[PDB]
């Protein structure tokens, strides 16, 4: 669409690497605006990653890791907020890339600002011209102090750069390769301009140089982006209290008409994914969900796996389990690690055990994400969440995943509840009995375009089909979450209880 | 971002006497501004705090009823009017900014619940 | 007024690691913090979710929560980590509350 989230696998391994470009190409394609990290690793010598091309700013930091990539292509790539930064220093982290693999030219002919955080670039055997690179020209005016550790050990021959650039300060060969300088050349005192001249000078607003004098013609925005117009701040909603008509929404570093499908609107108007202290989440008959003030002290509520107490737990174990008895709403997330069911000897935790799991069958919403890398062998199914409606994936597992199912035993999925995943993508791996992936109607849960199921090494859909393992009859359009008719998506008929009937 | 105090300084017993504290856009970036005081020699004590938004304001037992917190949004900028000012009240006076909203990941912009800049302080003695 | 904090003094050697508990109402975690002032100083924040690293501080800061106790812990103490801590807490009703401050004096 426009803006996309990012991811936050940082160096570690992808989880399923034979979907690993997939998951890239369902997050990036046709994606502007990364709100949040662009990590692009473990990629193969001969990916194809045209799915970037549309990148123009980063909101967090940009790291290319690991990969045999001979060319990365982030030329339109304009400006890195450094809202996050990798070892909470840099902003654009180029490590150990590599007929021979590895990453020859970084390319990126439109960065002209980084924000906050600084450049490292180290062990990159065929990397050229990144020494040559003017990075102080790059970082911002109140960025100056950020570290620029560039390693220039080469195992190739290094060609001179284009004639064309006139300060032999280049991206690569090519001669539309030359880096443009902005805060440099900068007659005055102006943080960025177009040109040598005074009258090139870019508006106050403006990130990363522009095409003229005026707050439209900014190349990027260096606080706000209302409709084309760069701004210090959204419009206020209220002007002290009557209603402002041309008042915004703050949302990452744009002025939205209305906050999107799946954040909270505050009462000063920023859009959130988590309401400040205090504060309690109030939906409407529309389905917008606002942060409100509480009236009276604040409801207790349900924590899950990264809020609160929980915001270092890493697994859902038998020494938390209680804390979700008869929730029906988790603010949280819930992951179930082979630690949950196998116990921890040495903190003297005992073993999940699978009727403990009926704490969850009142469990209804689950704001986080669904991580589940261990499940009982004696339960077929994951009919503890068969009560489950929404996974919000407000956050998301490495970035990415709102619901991930890996090393399972389980033959069927059983989610019969569940209609909405609000965010992120959903993974099902290697799960070796699961039968029934392909008969839910995912599309359905998904509310993007970018979101998508990424499946692999489950068991054969001929298989399934073969051993009879199928959609029941009274399912409608052969969408169903197990065997049966209480499994059905939709009832073509007749609902007794929970079970399909004639 | 900074916070920058003025208007403290000696006061009669029974007196009254202004503080201001100048913030970089605090009607729109959501945030409280607090005042906290620290005696000589004692612990830091909150004072008194305001909400952008509403003009809302909230003030500790102490001080309630006799300190008024308002804020000038045209100026942007927070004023503490103390009246009938006591021993107790002779401490360093920060104005601190607290609840500020910082972008993180996904676009969210979420509010940081502690006390991120604080001013210089200004000392106020009643004799 | 003040919820409790000990040790209420403190002493130790550069390299040391050092524990201060601030025992403080029930409340979500969210709303504690740690800010370490320096003499003649404000105050600068270290930890404002009890857990979470503000920008810019040094991770030997950490936080924790056991009950109702927080838990402010320096790894390896350095000659800069001479200075009073204390533990704010928000409650409902927009009341802010301190610790009575800890004070770590180098030996």
């Known amino acids: 669409t426009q803006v996309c989230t990012g991811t936050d696998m940082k160096l570690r391994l992808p989880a399923s690497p034979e979907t690993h470009l997939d998951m890239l190409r369902h997050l990036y394609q046709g994606c502007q605006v990364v709100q949040g990290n662009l990590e692009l690793t473990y990629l193969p010598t001969n990916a194809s990653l045209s799915f970037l091309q549309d990148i123009q700013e980063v909101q967090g930091y940009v790291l290319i890791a690991h990969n045999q990539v001979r060319q990365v292509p982030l030329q339109r790539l304009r400006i890195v907020r450094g809202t996050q930064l990798f070892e909470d220093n840099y902003a654009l982290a180029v490590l150990d890339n590599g007929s021979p693999g590895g990453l020859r030219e970084l390319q990126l002919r439109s960065l002209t600002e980084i924000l906050k955080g600084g450049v490292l670039i180290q062990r990159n055997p065929q990397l050229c011209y990144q020494d040559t690179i003017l990075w102080k020209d790059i970082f911002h005016k109140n960025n100056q102090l950020a570290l620029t550790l560039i390693d220039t050990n080469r195992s190739r021959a290094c060609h001179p750069c284009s004639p064309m650039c006139k300060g032999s300060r280049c991206w690569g060969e090519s001669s539309e390769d030359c880096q443009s300088l902005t805060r440099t050349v900068c007659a005055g005192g102006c943080a960025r301009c177009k040109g040598p001249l005074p009258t090139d000078c870019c508006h106050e607003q403006c990130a990363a140089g522009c095409t003229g004098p005026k707050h439209s013609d900014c190349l990027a925005c260096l606080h706000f982006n209302h409709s084309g117009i760069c701004e210090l701040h959204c419009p206020a909603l209220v002007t002290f209290s009557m209603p402002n008509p041309e008042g915004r929404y703050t949302f990452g570093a744009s002025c939205v008409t209305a906050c999107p499908y799946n954040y909270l609107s505050t009462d000063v108007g920023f859009c959130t994914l988590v309401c400040p202290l205090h504060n309690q989440e109030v939906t409407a008959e529309d389905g917008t969900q606002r942060c409100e003030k509480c009236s009276k002290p604040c409801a207790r509520v349900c924590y899950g796996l990264g809020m609160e107490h929980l915001r270092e737990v890493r697994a859902v174990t038998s020494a938390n389990i209680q804390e979700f008895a008869g929730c029906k709403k988790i603010f949280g997330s819930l992951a179930f690690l082979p630690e949950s069911f196998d116990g921890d000897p040495a903190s003297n935790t005992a073993p999940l055990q699978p009727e403990q799991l009926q704490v969850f069958e009142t469990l209804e919403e689950i704001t986080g994400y669904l991580y589940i890398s261990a499940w009982p062998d004696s339960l077929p199914d994951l009919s503890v969440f068969q009560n489950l409606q929404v996974i919000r994936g407000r956050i998301l597992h490495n970035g990415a995943y709102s619901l991930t199912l890996q090393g399972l035993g389980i033959s069927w999925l059983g989610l019969r509840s569940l209609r909405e995943l609000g965010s992120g993508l959903a993974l099902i791996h290697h799960n070796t009995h699961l039968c029934f992936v392909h008969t839910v109607p995912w599309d359905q849960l998904f509310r993007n375009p970018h979101q998508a199921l990424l499946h692999t090494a489950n068991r054969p859909e001929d298989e399934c089909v073969g051993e009879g393992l199928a959609c029941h009859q009274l399912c409608a359009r052969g969408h169903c979450w197990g065997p049966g008719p209480t499994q059905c998506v939709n009832c073509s008929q007749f609902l007794r209880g929970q079970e399909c009937v004639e | 971002v900074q916070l920058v105090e003025s208007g403290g300084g000696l006061v009669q017993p029974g007196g009254s006497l202004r503080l201001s504290c100048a913030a970089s856009?605090?009607?729109?970036?959501?945030?409280?501004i607090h005042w906290v005081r620290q005696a000589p020699g004692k612990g830091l004590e909150w004072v008194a705090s305001?909400?952008?938004?509403?003009?809302?304001?909230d003030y500790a037992d102490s001080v309630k009823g006799r300190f008024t917190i308002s804020a000038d949004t045209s100026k942007n900028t927070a004023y503490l009017q103390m009246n009938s000012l006591r021993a107790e009240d002779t401490a360093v006076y920060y104005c601190?900014?607290?609840?500020?909203?910082?972008?993180?990941?996904?676009?969210?912009?979420?509010?940081?619940?502690?006390?991120?800049?604080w001013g210089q302080g200004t000392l106020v003695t009643v004799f | 007024i003040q919820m409790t904090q000990s040790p209420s003094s403190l002493s130790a050697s550069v390299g040391d690691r050092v524990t201060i508990t601030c025992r403080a109402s029930?409340?979500?975690?969210?709303?504690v913090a740690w800010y370490q002032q320096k003499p003649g100083k404000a105050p600068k924040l270290l930890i404002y979710?009890?857990?979470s690293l503000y920008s810019g501080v040094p991770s030997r800061f950490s936080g924790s929560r056991s009950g109702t106790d927080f838990t402010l812990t320096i790894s390896s103490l350095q000659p800069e980590d001479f200075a009073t801590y204390y533990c704010?807490?928000?409650?409902?009703?927009?009341?802010?509350?301190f610790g009575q401050g800890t004070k770590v004096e180098i030996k």
């Open positions: 029930q409340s979500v975690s969210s709303a």
């Open positions: 601190a900014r607290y609840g500020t909203y910082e972008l993180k990941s996904y676009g969210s912009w979420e509010s940081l619940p502690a006390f991120d800049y």
């Open positions: 979710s009890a857990s």
């Open positions: 856009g605090f009607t729109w970036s959501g945030a409280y």
């Open positions: 704010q807490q928000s409650e409902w009703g927009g009341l802010i509350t």
């Open positions: 305001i909400y952008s938004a509403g003009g809302y304001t």
